[PDB]
Amino acid sequence: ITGTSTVGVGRGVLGDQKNINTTYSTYYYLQDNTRGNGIFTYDAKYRTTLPGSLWADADNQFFASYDAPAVDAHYYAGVTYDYYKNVHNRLSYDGNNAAIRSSVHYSQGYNNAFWNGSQMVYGDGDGQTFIPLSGGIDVVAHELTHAVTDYTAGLIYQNESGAINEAISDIFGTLVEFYANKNPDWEIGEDVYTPGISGDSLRSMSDPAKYGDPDHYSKRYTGTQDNGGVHINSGIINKAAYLISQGGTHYGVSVVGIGRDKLGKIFYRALTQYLTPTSNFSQLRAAAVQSATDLYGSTSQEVASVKQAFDAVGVK
Ligand SMILES: CC(C)C[C@H](NP(=O)(O)[C@H](Cc1ccccc1)NC(=O)OCc1ccccc1)C(=O)N[C@@H](C)C(=O)O
Numbered sequence: 001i002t003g004t005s006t007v008g009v010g011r012g013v014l015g016d017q018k019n020i021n022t023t024y025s026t027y028y029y030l031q032d033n034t035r036g037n038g039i040f041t042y043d044a045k046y047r048t049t050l051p052g053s054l055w056a057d058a059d060n061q062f063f064a065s066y067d068a069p070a071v072d073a074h075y076y077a078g079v080t081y082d083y084y085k086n087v088h089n090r091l092s093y094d095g096n097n098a099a100i101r102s103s104v105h106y107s108q109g110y111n112n113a114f115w116n117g118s119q120m121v122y123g124d125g126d127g128q129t130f131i132p133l134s135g136g137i138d139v140v141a142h143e144l145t146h147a148v149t150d151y152t153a154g155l156i157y158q159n160e161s162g163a164i165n166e167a168i169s170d171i172f173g174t175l176v177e178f179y180a181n182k183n184p185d186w187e188i189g190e191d192v193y194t195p196g197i198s199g200d201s202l203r204s205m206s207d208p209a210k211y212g213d214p215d216h217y218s219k220r221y222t223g224t225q226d227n228g229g230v231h232i233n234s235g236i237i238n239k240a241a242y243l244i245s246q247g248g249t250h251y252g253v254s255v256v257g258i259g260r261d262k263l264g265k266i267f268y269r270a271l272t273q274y275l276t277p278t279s280n281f282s283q284l285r286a287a288a289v290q291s292a293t294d295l296y297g298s299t300s301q302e303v304a305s306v307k308q309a310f311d312a313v314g315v316k
């Protein structure tokens with residue numbers, strides 16, 4: 001909408017107070033004009049019609065329980081935009097400052113979040129498996145990263161290419177979580193998953209097998225559920241990325257860690273310059289090796305560590 005940029009205040013899903021960029025024209029709308037061509041947050045009103053209504057508020061204060069998922073979807077989209085711009089010189093998901101749209105309160109008791117080809121969408125959860133999913137910064141950045149992938153490598157959402165697509169979203173979701181630097185970890189979704197169980201998460205990148213996901217190519221899922229295991233076999237790539245950054249010895253193979261920032265540079269370059277819609281795990285290894293060669297040189301530790309990490313997870 002046309003209006004003037006304003007700054008509201010509210011509380012997110014976890015009860016934390018934050019300022020949000022809004023737009024005033026009769027109402028205060030969840031429309032942040034400070035980033036690209038805007039970040040816009042919508043109310044789906046417990047239905048499945050999308051996007052729903054641009055979020056309108058009478059007083060620019062967002063402390064109601066119903067407001068909390070919207071506050072976080074809006075704010076964490078801003079953090080994610082900032083990460084891509086400041087760290088990778090990428091302007092929004094398309095590289096040309098496309099408007100970023102999110103809807104919250106999607107459906108009833110909906111235990112998921114998604115990118116629908118055009119926007120991000122967040123369920124509220126059922127209060128048992130999830131609380132409102134925009135409360136997880138890694139979740140928000142995971143969804144927005146699906147948009148980045150759509151506009152870059154375009155990895156098809158099935159089998160190995162789809163597991164790479166998933167892992168890219170988990171990797172950058174985690175790097176955004178570290179960028180914001182609030183309780184960062186290598187787990188996925190811990191802030192919104194299972195409110196009645198402490199210390200768990202939807203997935204782990206540091207130890208995927210803690211939740212039955214594979215951590216070695218010899219343990220990959222080959223069936224048809226989950227689009228050929230896209231959320232399962234992502235553990236093999238997530239583990240490789242974790243090893244590149246943090247190091248470790250895994251199935252007897254030692255990896256010298258090179259840190260999160262270099263992991264992010266290598267995988268961002270692979271995603272944007274080398275991966276294609278049909279890339280498989282072996283092709284991802286080659287793309288990561290070439291990316292690290294471009295950035296650091298063929299004789300570098302960074303290239304050696306990429307090779308060690310893929311060796312450790314059984315990907316040649
Ligand atoms: C980070 C977590 C909290 C959310 C994350 N959702 P997610 O982002 O993985 C969501 C899952 C989904 C698919 C279809 C319909 C509805 C929902 N997938 C999704 O949005 O895929 C977007 C996409 C579009 C084109 C090509 C490739 C990908 C996830 O891991 N979902 C698990 C629970 C799953 O769906 O198994």
Ligand SMILES: [Ca+2]
Pocket residue numbers: 057058059060061062063
């Ligand atoms: Ca209000």
Ligand SMILES: [Ca+2]
Pocket residue numbers: 177182183184185190191
């Ligand atoms: Ca965390």
Ligand SMILES: [Ca+2]
Pocket residue numbers: 138174177184185186187188189190
């Ligand atoms: Ca996390």
Ligand SMILES: [Ca+2]
Pocket residue numbers: 190192193194195196197198199200201
């Ligand atoms: Ca939990």
Ligand SMILES: [Cs+]
Pocket residue numbers: 201202203211
């Ligand atoms: Cs789990």
Ligand SMILES: [Zn+2]
Pocket residue numbers: 142146166169
């Ligand atoms: Zn995903």
